[PDB]
């Protein structure tokens, strides 16, 4: 039932209704020989839509907007990128040209700039310290500390108890660590624990890539990060 790379051909995007006014957007990516699904989030904010992360790149993101415009019909007015990597900010220029107001922490914007990636226009203050949380429309933005990246943020939708971890949280099918070049392996577990202590009520946990699950994805991720560290 949850879209997999089997139901989504490269360059296309599919939306999945997780709860009322809450969706995940799935896009198939092709990287270094393999193909895999990438998850994003969409949260109804009144009569508008809040988008969490791009679909990696201009084309895919443009396809994302198109799939939203026809399946949902509400205007995407704001967007938040969970970290500076190209798969999460790539497509921001497209979002900006469509009238979407793009956001990201100063930390993320700084890192994207240094990396030469697209840069969300607006800045999200109040998230520079581990454990920081701020309300942003229908969701709560949370910085658990360095993990997959030193700037990664996780998103929680209180009304639906949906937690989007971005690449900070792995799916069960992932047995080994992914790209940990810019990750803080030493802090990742402690950051996961902060996520656990802040959202003990989460019912649906969405990993950066793959099938959603429950809060056990946190421990899974921790198990995988631990093993990699050793
Ligand atoms: Zn990344
Ligand atoms: Zn603006």
Describe the structure.
Zn(2+) 2 binds at residues 83, 85, 87, 148. Mg(2+) 2 binds at residue 12. Pfam families: Lactamase_B. Mg(2+) 3 binds at residue 138. Zn(2+) 3 binds at residues 87, 167. The chain has 230 residues and is an alpha/beta fold. It has one domain: Ribonuclease Z/Hydroxyacylglutathione hydrolase-like (Metallo-beta-lactamase, Chain A, 4-Layer Sandwich), CATH 3.60.15.10. The protein has helices at residues 58-71, 86-89, 92-97, 106-115, 188-198, 216-229; strands at residues 13-19, 22-31, 34-45, 48-52, 76-80, 101-104, 122-123, 133-136, 139-142, 154-157, 162-166, 204-207. The strands form two sheets. A seven-stranded mixed beta sheet has the order 1-2-3-4-5-6-7. Strands 8-9-10-11-12 form a five-stranded mixed beta sheet, with no helix packed on it. Strand 3 and strand 4 form a beta hairpin. One zinc ion binds next to loops.
List the SSEs and their pairings.
Layout: E1 13-19, E2 22-31, E3 34-45, E4 48-52, H1 58-71, E5 76-80, H2 86-89, H3 92-97, E6 101-104, H4 106-115, E7 122-123, E8 133-136, E9 139-142, E10 154-157, E11 162-166, H5 188-198, E12 204-207, H6 216-229
Parallel strand pairs: 4-5, 5-6, 6-7, 11-12
Antiparallel strand pairs: 1-2, 2-3, 3-4, 8-9, 9-10, 10-11
Helix pairs in contact: 5-6
The structure holds zinc ion (ZN) (2 copies).
PDB class: hydrolase
Keywords: alpha-beta/beta-alpha fold, hydrolase
Assembly: monomeric
CATH class: Alpha Beta
Instruction: Indicate the structural class.
Output: alpha/beta
Assess the beta-strand content as a share of residues. 25-35%
Q: What letter string, H or E per element, gives the SSE order?
A: EEEEHEHHEHEEEEEHEH
Bound molecules: zinc ion
Strand order of the largest sheet: 1-2-3-4-5-6-7
Give the total of beta strands: 12
Helix content: 25-40%
Annotated CATH topology: Metallo-beta-lactamase, Chain A
Shape: globular
Q: What's the total helix number?
A: 6
Give Rg in angstroms.
Answer: 16 Å
CATH architecture: 4-Layer Sandwich
Largest sheet: 7 strands, mixed
PDB class: hydrolase
Keywords: alpha-beta/beta-alpha fold, hydrolase
Assembly: monomeric
Entry title: VIM-2, a Zn-beta-lactamase from Pseudomonas aeruginosa with an oxidized Cys (cysteinesulfonic)
